[PDB]
Amino acid sequence: GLIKTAYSDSSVTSADRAVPSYYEPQTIIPDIDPKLQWVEDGEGQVINQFEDMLQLV
Amino acid sequence: GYESTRPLRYGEASLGPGQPLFYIDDEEVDFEKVINAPLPKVPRDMTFTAHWLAVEGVQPSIPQNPTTAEDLLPKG
Amino acid sequence: RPRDARTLELLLTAQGVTSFEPRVSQLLLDFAYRHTAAVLSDALHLSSITANAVALAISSRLGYQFRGGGGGYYGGGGGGASKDWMLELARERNKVALPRVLPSEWGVRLPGERFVLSGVS
Amino acid sequence: ASLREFLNKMDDYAPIIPDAVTNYYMTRAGLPPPPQTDIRLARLLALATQKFIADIAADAYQYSRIRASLGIQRPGYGGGGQGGSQNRTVLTMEDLGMAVSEFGVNVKRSEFYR
Amino acid sequence: NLNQIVTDYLKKKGFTRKYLKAFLLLKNWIDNNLDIYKFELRKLLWPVFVYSYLELVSQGYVDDAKHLLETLRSHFEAVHQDQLALLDENHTTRLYRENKYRIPLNQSLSGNLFHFLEREADNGGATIIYILQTHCSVETSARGPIEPYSFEAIYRRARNLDLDEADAHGVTNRDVLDTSARARDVVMEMQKVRENRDRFVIEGRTGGIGIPVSACMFTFHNTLGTVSCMDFSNDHKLVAVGTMDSYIRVWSLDGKPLKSALENEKNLKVNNRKLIGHSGPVYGVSFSDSSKLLLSCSADGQIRLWSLEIWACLCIYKAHDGPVFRVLWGPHGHYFASAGWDKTVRVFTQDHASAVRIMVGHDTSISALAWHPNGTYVFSASDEMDKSIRMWSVITGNCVRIFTGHTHYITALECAHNGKILASADTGGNIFIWDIEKGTLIKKCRGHGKGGIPSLSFSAESNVLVSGGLDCTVRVWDIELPADPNQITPDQISAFATKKTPVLKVRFTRMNLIVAGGCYDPE
Numbered sequence A: 001g002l003i004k005t006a007y008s009d010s011s012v013t014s015a016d017r018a019v020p021s022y023y024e025p026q027t028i029i030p031d032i033d034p035k036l037q038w039v040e041d042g043e044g045q046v047i048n049q050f051e052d053m054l055q056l057v
Numbered sequence B: 001g002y003e004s005t006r007p008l009r010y011g012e013a014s015l016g017p018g019q020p021l022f023y024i025d026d027e028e029v030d031f032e033k034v035i036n037a038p039l040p041k042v043p044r045d046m047t048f049t050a051h052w053l054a055v056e057g058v059q060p061s062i063p064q065n066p067t068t069a070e071d072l073l074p075k076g
Numbered sequence C: 001r002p003r004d005a006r007t008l009e010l011l012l013t014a015q016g017v018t019s020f021e022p023r024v025s026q027l028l029l030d031f032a033y034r035h036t037a038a039v040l041s042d043a044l045h046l047s048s049i050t051a052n053a054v055a056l057a058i059s060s061r062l063g064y065q066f067r068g069g070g071g072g073y074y075g076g077g078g079g080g081a082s083k084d085w086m087l088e089l090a091r092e093r094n095k096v097a098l099p100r101v102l103p104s105e106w107g108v109r110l111p112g113e114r115f116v117l118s119g120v121s
Numbered sequence D: 001a002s003l004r005e006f007l008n009k010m011d012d013y014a015p016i017i018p019d020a021v022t023n024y025y026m027t028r029a030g031l032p033p034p035p036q037t038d039i040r041l042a043r044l045l046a047l048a049t050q051k052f053i054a055d056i057a058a059d060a061y062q063y064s065r066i067r068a069s070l071g072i073q074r075p076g077y078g079g080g081g082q083g084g085s086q087n088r089t090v091l092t093m094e095d096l097g098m099a100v101s102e103f104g105v106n107v108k109r110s111e112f113y114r
Numbered sequence E: 001n002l003n004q005i006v007t008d009y010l011k012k013k014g015f016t017r018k019y020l021k022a023f024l025l026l027k028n029w030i031d032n033n034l035d036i037y038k039f040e041l042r043k044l045l046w047p048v049f050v051y052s053y054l055e056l057v058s059q060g061y062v063d064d065a066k067h068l069l070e071t072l073r074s075h076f077e078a079v080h081q082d083q084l085a086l087l088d089e090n091h092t093t094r095l096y097r098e099n100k101y102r103i104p105l106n107q108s109l110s111g112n113l114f115h116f117l118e119r120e121a122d123n124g125g126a127t128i129i130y131i132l133q134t135h136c137s138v139e140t141s142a143r144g145p146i147e148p149y150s151f152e153a154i155y156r157r158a159r160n161l162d163l164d165e166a167d168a169h170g171v172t173n174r175d176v177l178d179t180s181a182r183a184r185d186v187v188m189e190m191q192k193v194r195e196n197r198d199r200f201v202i203e204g205r206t207g208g209i210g211i212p213v214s215a216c217m218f219t220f221h222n223t224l225g226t227v228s229c230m231d232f233s234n235d236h237k238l239v240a241v242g243t244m245d246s247y248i249r250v251w252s253l254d255g256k257p258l259k260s261a262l263e264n265e266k267n268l269k270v271n272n273r274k275l276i277g278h279s280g281p282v283y284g285v286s287f288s289d290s291s292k293l294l295l296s297c298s299a300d301g302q303i304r305l306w307s308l309e310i311w312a313c314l315c316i317y318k319a320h321d322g323p324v325f326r327v328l329w330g331p332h333g334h335y336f337a338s339a340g341w342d343k344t345v346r347v348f349t350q351d352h353a354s355a356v357r358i359m360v361g362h363d364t365s366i367s368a369l370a371w372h373p374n375g376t377y378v379f380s381a382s383d384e385m386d387k388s389i390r391m392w393s394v395i396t397g398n399c400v401r402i403f404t405g406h407t408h409y410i411t412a413l414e415c416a417h418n419g420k421i422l423a424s425a426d427t428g429g430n431i432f433i434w435d436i437e438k439g440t441l442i443k444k445c446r447g448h449g450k451g452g453i454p455s456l457s458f459s460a461e462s463n464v465l466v467s468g469g470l471d472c473t474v475r476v477w478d479i480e481l482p483a484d485p486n487q488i489t490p491d492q493i494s495a496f497a498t499k500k501t502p503v504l505k506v507r508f509t510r511m512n513l514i515v516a517g518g519c520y521d522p523e
Helices: B031-036 C005-013 C024-046 C051-061 C083-093 D003-013 D019-029 D039-067 D093-103 E002-012 E019-030 E035-059 E062-076 E081-087 E091-098 E107-119 E121-135 E151-159 E188-197
Strands: B047-054 E101-106 E136-141 E214-221 E227-232 E238-243 E248-252 E272-275 E282-287 E293-298 E303-307 E312-317 E324-329 E335-340 E345-349 E357-359 E366-371 E377-382 E388-393 E399-404 E410-415 E421-426 E431-435 E440-445 E455-458 E464-468 E473-478 E492-497 E503-508 E513-519
Touching: B047 E492, C005 C024, C024 C051, C083 E357, D003 D039, D019 D039, D039 D093, E019 E035, E019 E062, E019 E121, E035 E062, E035 E081, E035 E091, E035 E101, E035 E107, E035 E121, E062 E081, E101 E107, E107 E121, E107 E136, E107 E188, E121 E136, E227 E282, E227 E503, E227 E513, E238 E282, E238 E293, E293 E324, E293 E335, E324 E366, E335 E366, E345 E377, E366 E410, E377 E410, E410 E455, E421 E455, E455 E503, E464 E503, E464 E513, E473 E503
Parallel strands: E101 E136, E214 E513, E282 E324
Antiparallel strands: B047 E214, E227 E238, E238 E248, E248 E272, E282 E293, E293 E303, E303 E312, E324 E335, E335 E345, E345 E357, E366 E377, E377 E388, E388 E399, E410 E421, E421 E431, E431 E440, E455 E464, E464 E473, E473 E492, E503 E513
16 A cells, blocks of 8 residues: 555456665666546546536536 | 437338338437437546566466467467 | 439448438438539530530639649649749748747737737627 | 527426536537537527427428328339228338428438348 | 669760857756755856846847846846946946955765756857856855755854854855854866766667656547647647637647736636537647647638637638648647648648648649658658658758558658658558668568557657557557567557547657547547
């Protein structure tokens, strides 16, 4: 529970080195803003993370 | 009248041996069935996301990218 | 599925279209029917009817529609204007000097008050 | 009659066309939705549309009724199935085509495609 | 033989066989360094400003001097009120002119400053160099950086030392280093720096492989296949898409709220807006050279200019007869071009309601456009029977080059930044590279699938090209292959695949990174 990521396989449905990551610069992937990440619900729709600006019809 | 969402079906008449004719299938309906029918489902609103398609020339294996299982490399 | 519908779909497929919408071929067939009926009626009114009557009817119809297509050198496409008239108009227009602009107005000036949407609320 | 009084009374002359359809087609035609455009104007436009459709419907019914009681349908108005049920009046392609021909529309089709 | 015909034709025709810019640039450079250096760097701001102001006053451009004084007064209003009021001849000006300013600095800082000034000699650094030489003198020292809590200041305060010649000569370090709390050879140093710097240039390329690049992808969901065009702003802060429903939608690429200059919309919370007013499908959009203006064209035959500050239309241009398919701003954003169904190319300026130039010569509809980096030439391409590319002159309005060879519908055109190369793609998957001056094809690139290549982009130095196709791929090409040390062409550096997302736009940033965009369709 330190960060939020969308790398889990459930997000989209539609040697074992014992060193910290900063020892291998050639394996690091930059981070995306959580509000802009591609996460899907069970049905298969893309969840909108901007609940502040949503309005009801 | 060509923007309807209903399926297109053709009948088949036989004027004779080897001379078929086709007509559009159209059955009379009552106004109750049309007026009382439910509306289709409303799709969700437009939105956009982001992800990394490639880092330093290599494609990460994340859910947002295609699987390696399924023309991208010269072999001459 | 009727005949010539498969043929039109095959023709479309053989030209790059990778997908269609069911109803296009019906639209094309009905358009062909209506065009044939109109031309036939015109030819019948003109004059048993010969080929000259049909040619005259088509020529008359070409005066107010079908001014398009993929015509090339001296083909009546894109409105049907002649290249000499367009060249004359271009010569007339391209004779004036380009507008004078200063660095302090480059990107902020607009047309006169008569050609702007001011006060449309 | 005056435009001001009519617009003020527009409360009592709302048509049956839902506001969603009005907003959708106004946006398609190039006019922003009611929040930026007085709702009275949108209601007026929808009422004009309703009046136009009702006029066409009355013309079609008049055409259908005079035909009711040689005796072969006019070519170019293909459509239908068994022919309906009972002695009910059926809105068919022929009457609609005859009615809208007076408004400048052509709805000619083919009966059999072969 | 065409050569015989051309020779006969030619023979029959008788053919015989100022200071404010520099100050702002220096300030912007200064605030970019580490906070350690800034304390010593800020000492250069006041002398430069005062000497520039006095020079402008003396030269007779009193208007420019007044403008400089009023513009920068807010910056120094909290330190030198009395001096600024005096500047509103007295002995103060004479004393300033007679005695040249003395500013202490470190050797490494001096070297960095000289290198930076040389790097931008023609951009405005020459003015600062001249001012510093003439009206100023730098007493370089080997001490460490001077700061209220650095080693040098702490040592001097604790050990009760004495000031130096540099420290002797209205902010003075004496108030800091006292208990109450060398010269320079510029000009010579400049040629000297240039000689040292010229030794570290790269002048060859042998062996090796192509450059690696990264990519970021933006995907649009729930579009239902109604999106027709796409465009990013020049700084990659906004994205606009036109639809088949006649409206346009702009988003914030980071999700932050958009702002409106209207007072009634003070601090409203929305990150996407709509531009309505077209009555037909929108086919082109273009952000102006932050961007405040936007252009769009539709099938109804109109071009509309929108405002990104109040989010409303301003003017309509009505020169076309039929659909308009493409619209493009000029390389600097006052001129724009358009072309559509009626087989003509028109050039506009935003100040006039009628096209200033009309370009005739194509035999079919136009399907692509492009500007030259210098802003005085335009490129266009036609389809069908006449598949050719043409280069027009904006001064005269005549054609000067024709390129032939394409056998398929042409979808994209692009001109290199250096101004000497041109790229084009068609629906057969081919990419052509043309020499503009000689009008000759250089080479062909292959590897893309059939369908179309909507966009192209050139690297900053014009040595790498990136393309996006409707086959859901992004590919990188090498314009010139490395010299040998002794279905797909061998110059394709990389190729990436998307997850069922046709690519409608690719863009090269300042770095070796690109941004792409497309629409996701599950089917």
